[PDB]
Nucleic acid binder design. Structure first.
Lengths: 38, 94, 141, 136
RNA sequence: AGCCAGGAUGUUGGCUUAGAAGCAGCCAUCAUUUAAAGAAAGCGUAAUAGCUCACUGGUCGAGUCGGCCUGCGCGGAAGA
């Protein structure tokens, strides 16, 4: 995954979830869209 | 067609005006015709959503102050520089 | 036809038999026969006129290879048979490349009624003139 | 890069950047990129932002750069002591206050003006906002 | 928001089409039976094809959608 300080929805299947106080982008379509730490 | 409920400003100057805008109002004045100018305080949100329309700057407004009605027209508005809010409005009588 | 069971649409100009450079095993990847584009397809092509590709439904059954009936002449080479230059469209609508007389499209549209969407003459008239909008063909009113 | 064609004196004092701005309404165009932060803007940041806008809303539209640098900023070289004169003119900045409409745009829909002004406000050092042409 | 249905024809539209037949291409970007449909919004092909959607019907039985102004907070945040 991509640890960035701007996490965004790159696709329409991407989805912002906060787990353990960490903003994350969980996608189902493309696993390259998986992101962390916004 | 706009009715703007107002009060009379018993205080003026920069202290009183800045106190008046922190309380979510803003000052204004009604001058023109032969009468004395009338210092007026106005609620902020009503006038801001009201002036989002175009007809606020063209149509004759009606300002209700002390239970009277003064048919005015919005002459000139001072806006805040970098915020979407108002500093002051000049209303010419009509 | 039915649910999609090994029918596709492919060939080029069918004045000749069995186009080997353009498609080849594209008509041999599914159960569609290699031989049935060569003799019997031209036997079913000579019934009207040659020199036209045919996008066609080839339903491959548990028979020898399949059974085939050609139904409609398509409007691509029907709107290229008398349009202008023989090269192609490129950027046809921003200038005036082609022009088509509308009476022959009224009679071909009056002929073609199987593979269309419409029940009135005027309803499907400027649909083929929409294909004239496709290749920039200026209609002569 | 923007720079005055011909000055009157080569080196300017620092001076300060206080108070609010003068160019405040969207005057020429229809949509505006208005400053909120104070800061100052070099000519490279104005050029960078203008290329972001001009790319973004393609060669349609019309864009006004309402600020102009005209203030020379001098720097001393590296491993030079203090003193021994004022430095050399390296670049040119415009001083910005809260309220300056930095850019204007006309001839596009509002949603492209949002898009180009987002794209170009990320090339500037000051916090910025979007404004429209208000009528009086 | 879920869930059950439909979502095409000229359209191989010509392409430099070597295979693009909506899918490594550009111009167009129309018109109809139709509640509704893009000469295809996402993937995908040796290549059509394959699906989903954009829109509409039924089930559903009370709120929901996205902006603005704000207070306090989260990430950004590694040193002997």
């Amino acid at each position: 995954m991509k640890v960035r300080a701007s996490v965004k929805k790159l696709c329409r299947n991407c989805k912002i979830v906060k787990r353990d106080g960490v903003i994350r982008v969980i996608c189902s379509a493309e696993p390259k869209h998986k992101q962390r730490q916004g | 067609m706009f009715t703007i409920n107002a009060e009379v400003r018993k205080e003026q100057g920069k202290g009183a005006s800045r106190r008046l805008r922190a309380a979510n109002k803003f000052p204004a004045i009604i001058y023109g015709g032969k009468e004395a100018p009338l210092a007026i305080e106005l609620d902020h949100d009503k006038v801001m959503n009201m002036q989002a329309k175009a007809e606020f700057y063209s149509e004759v407004l009606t300002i209700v102050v002390d239970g009277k009605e003064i048919k005015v027209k919005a002459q000139d508005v001072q806006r805040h520089p970098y915020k979407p809010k108002l500093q002051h409005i000049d209303f010419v009588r009509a | 036809a039915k649910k999609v069971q090994a029918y596709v649409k492919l060939q080029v100009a069918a004045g000749m038999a069995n186009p080997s450079p353009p498609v080849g095993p594209a008509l041999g990847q599914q159960g569609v026969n290699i031989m049935e584009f060569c003799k019997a397809f031209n036997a079913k092509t000579d019934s009207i006129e040659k020199g036209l590709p045919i996008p066609v439904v080839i339903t491959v059954y548990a028979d020898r290879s399949f059974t085939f009936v050609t139904k409609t002449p398509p409007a691509a080479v029907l709107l290229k048979k008398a349009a202008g230059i023989k090269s192609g469209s490129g950027k046809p609508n921003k200038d005036k490349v082609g022009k088509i007389s509308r009476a022959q499209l009224q009679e071909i549209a009056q002929t073609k009624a199987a593979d269309m969407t419409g029940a009135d003459i005027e309803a499907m008239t400027r649909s083929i003139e929409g294909t004239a909008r496709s290749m920039g063909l200026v209609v002569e009113d | 890069m923007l720079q005055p064609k011909r000055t009157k004196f080569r080196k300017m004092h620092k001076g300060r950047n206080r108070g609010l701005a003068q160019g405040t309404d969207v005057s020429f165009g229809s949509f505006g990129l208005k400053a909120v932060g104070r800061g100052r803007l070099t000519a490279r940041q104005i050029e960078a932002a203008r290329r972001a806008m001009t790319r973004a809303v393609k060669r349609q539209g019309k864009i006004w750069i309402r600020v102009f640098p005209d203030k020379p900023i001098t720097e001393k070289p590296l491993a030079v002591r203090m003193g021994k004169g004022k430095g050399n003119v390296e670049y040119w900045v415009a001083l910005i206050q809260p309220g300056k409409v930095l850019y204007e745009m006309d001839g596009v829909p509002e949603e492209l003006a949002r898009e180009a002004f987002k794209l170009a406000a990320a090339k500037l050092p000051i916090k910025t906002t979007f404004v429209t042409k208000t009528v009086m």
